[PDB]
Every structure is written in structure tokens, then in C-alpha cells.
């Protein structure tokens, strides 16, 4: 192994894979690019791979559209890349304990660098309540619409220039940890 | 250790970490930057770290969003960096004594330079009363609104140019020690 | 010790500290600056410190906001820097004799150059009566308003150019010995 040119290793969490390849978990896009380009100049292809939170989540989601298309989930969190956390829709999900254990091992196959994948049924009430709470904190009333498989919070109120930005950060916050798979959002000028 | 180029050490409180790294508690941003740049010219990376009150509080808060998302708190004070004080929402917090002791040890892990973290349940009545008192001292009446998990004091009155600045310092004062997590503020021109 | 370049020592009251450092009590800002700059050219840092009435009072007040935030006080007088006098709000203060003795020792820790700190409960009636008297001496009637924790004397009367200056000196006088912590002031044109 190594098959690593990350040094300076700041913002490069390098994890050993189960497939005998190295996965350099880069903090951001510019770091990912830096490490991939340097490894390529260095003739460390194939075995030396560079990854990040966004690409690995989308990669697993693409695999899931084919093998667990009915999986109701939120997002895979890579706060600890060696132990990814997989947020599932508590109520929309109808999988068994053992089926979820298989799902984890399948993601472990998708993530050789991961030791194990911690799949957790996240309370759909908590998802809805997180969105509810964030809006109410910003004095943003909403009308709750119902799209297939979820709800859409339509923010009421003629918002000011910066109040709109406040609502955009709220929306992004929910889309960072939960995603747009359960509560989606809209803005409409009222009152 | 050391792995220190702070000299002149004025405004650089250097504390030894539990992880065998040094944490230079700098008085301000310009000092933080000065020390980080000088340590870097000096080839004292990794083990020689430079920190401050604002970055360390935000760093712990980011960790808390993942592991104690339901933690109702105000702010972590670094008046004594070696013994950080952690203001919690007395009433909104439902944690036990031992759970709070774990929370402290978790922050001690987040702050190797800290000897211990003193977590204290701050009276939510006192928070509200601090805001109330600061406004009344400046002859600023307010309408108490209710956002999720707190209240919003909407300052009544067509304020003058400098009265507005008086209200801004009041608001900042509360946002310095309590933060915008319980009493938030607004201004509206009346009378 | 010394660790002193004050000479000419006129307007430089040099007091020995309990922390084995020297505190040059300078008469004014320009003297403070002069002594700090000269000590610095001289390589007498650390042990040779330069102080004044305004900075030392504000320094102790900042410490008090964290450890005795409920302390109702006026101002610390440095007429005799070696024995600072600490004016407290007689009625607003609810501290015991021994708690006040601790408060003094805490300020003695904040002021190594001080032998002892004389804390005195100043009659709030006298504070109010000082303000009352100063206004009445200048033929300035006022309406007594009530802000949280104090009163605001609103000066009645269309004042002339120099009468306004007379009221400003009155206000400053009260803000010199009592401060704006109990009786505050305003001006409004009437009659």
C-alpha cells in the first residue's frame, strides 16, 4: 500500500480499504483535486484513490437506485468517514433488522475504507419538527402542502432581502443533514 | 513539546494539551494569525496549534450539532481558557447530572488544553431578565413575541441615529454572553 | 524590582505590587503612553507596568461582569491609588460584610499595587440628592423617569447655548464620581 502523496496531510484523512486500495478522505473539492492530480503525476493510480463526503454519498445513492430503489432515506453522513452514519426514514422504511444489516454490508462493499456503516432510523417526526422549528425560529409561518412521500413547507410572508437569505440558510441546513427527500420548501409573498 | 514561537508572549496564553500538543490561546484574530504564520515559518506544525475563544466555541458547537443536537445551551466562555465555562439553558435542558458530566468530558476531549469544563445551568429567567433590564435601562419598551424555543423582544419606538446604536450595543451585549439562542431582538418604529 | 524609567517622576506615582511587579500610576493618558514607550525602549517589560484611574476601573469592572455581575456599584476612585475607594449602591447591594471583604480581596488581587480596597456603601439617596441638587443649583427642573434599576432626570426647559453646556458639566460631574449606573440624564426643550 501507499500509494499516498497527501503530505502535507492536513485535511487528508487517509483510510485503508478492504479491497487493498487507499482512500484519501479529503476535506473539500480543492483538496480532492489537489490529491488526485498529485497522485497522477506520481504514478499512484488505481490503488491510490481520493474521496469526499458529497461524492461518496451520491455514489452510494446511484447504486441504491438500482438495488434498493424503495429505500426511504435521508443522507449518509461522513463526520467519521471510517464509520459512516446512514439516516433512514423511520416511518417510510419497511425493512427488517437483518435486511438493514445487509444494506450496511452492501455499503461496506461500496466503502472499503469504512469499518462499518451505522444505519439509523431517523424519526420522521423529528425531521418535520426540525424544519418546523427552524422556520418558527425565524418567524416564518408556512402552509404545509403534501407531495408524494412527503410534505412541502410553503413559507408565508413578503420577506425582505436579508429575510429571504435567512430562509435560504434555513433550507440549506435542512438539506445538509436531512436532504430534500422528506420536507421540501417554497416561498410565497403574503400579508 | 514547544513547538512555540509566541515570544513576545504578551496576549498569548499557552496551555499544554492532553493530546501532547500545545494550544496557544491568542487574545484576538490578528494574534492568532500572527502565531500560526510564525509557527509555520518555524516548522512547528501539527503539535503547535493556535486557538481563540470564538473558534473554539464554534468548533465545539459544530461537534454538538452531531452528538447533542438537542442540547439547549447559550455559549462557552473562555475567560479562563484552562477552565472553560459552559452556559446551559436551565429550563430547556433535560439532561441529568451524569449526562452533563459526560458532556464535560466530551468537551475536555474537544479541548485537550482544558483541565476541566464547568457546565452550569443558567437560569432562563435571568437570561430573559438580562435582556429585559438592558432594554429598560435604555428606555426601550418592547413587545415580547414567541419564536420556537424562545422569545423575541421587538423594540418599540422611532429611535434616533444614536439610540439605534444604543440598542445595537445592548443586543450585542446579550449576544456576547447569552447568544441569540433564547432571546432574539428586533426593532420597529412606533409612537 | 525597578524596572522603572519614570524620571522625571512628576505625575508618576510608582507603587510596588504584591505580584513582584511595579505599577506606575500615571496622572493622565499622555503620561501613561510616555512611560509605557520609554520602559519598552528600555527593555523593562513584564515587571514594569504603567496604569491609570480610568483603565484600572474599567479593568476591574470587566472582571466583575463575570464574577459579581449582580454587584450594584458606582465607581472605583483612585485619589489614593494605594488605597482605592470602591463606591457601592447602598440599597441595590444585598451583599454581606464578609462577602464585601472577599470582594475587596478580589480587587486586591486585581490591584497588586494596592494595600487594601476600601469598599463603602454609598447612600443611594445621596446619589439622587447630588444630582437633584446640581440641577436645582442651575435652575434646572426635571421630570424624574424610572429606568430599570434607577431613575432618569429629564431636564425641562429651552436651554440657551451656554445653559446646555452648564447642564453638560453637571452631568459629567455626576458621571465622574457616581457614574451613569443610578441617575441618568436627558434634556428636553420646554416652556
Residue numbers in the entry:
A (entry chain X), B (entry chain A), C (entry chain B): 173 to 363
Sentences from the paper on this structure:
The major structural scaffold of the basal body is comprised largely of three proteins that arrange into a series of highly oligomerized, concentric rings: two intimately associated proteins localized to the IM - PrgK/EscJ/MxiJ and PrgH/EscD/MxiG, and a third protein belonging to the secretin family of OM proteins, InvG/EscC/MxiD (Salmonella enterica serovar Typhimurium SPI-1, Enteropathogenic Escherichia coli (EPEC) LEE and Shigella dysenteriae nomenclature, respectively). In summary, we report the crystal structures for the cytoplasmic and periplasmic domains of PrgH and InvG, two of the main basal body components of the prototypical Salmonella SPI-1 injectisome.
For both the cytoplasmic and periplasmic domains of PrgH, we applied a 24-mer oligomerization constraint, according to the established stoichiometry. We therefore performed the docking procedures using residues 173–361, which led to a model with excellent correlation to the EM map. Importantly, our PrgH periplasmic domain model possesses fully refined interfaces. For the periplasmic domain of PrgH, we engineered numerous interface and surface mutations. Notably, we identified a loop (residues 319–324) that mediates several side- and main-chain contacts with the adjacent subunit. Side-chain mutations within this loop (K320L, T324L) have no effect on secretion; however, mutation of the conformationally labile Gly322 to a leucine abrogates secretion (middle), suggesting that the loop main chain conformation/contacts are more critical to interface integrity. However, mutant variant G322Y in the periplasmic domain of PrgH, or Q97L in InvG, disrupts needle complex assembly. Finally, analysis of the surface electrostatics of the InvG and PrgH periplasmic ring models reveals an acidic surface present on the face of the InvG ring proximal to PrgH, and a complementary basic surface on the corresponding face of PrgH.
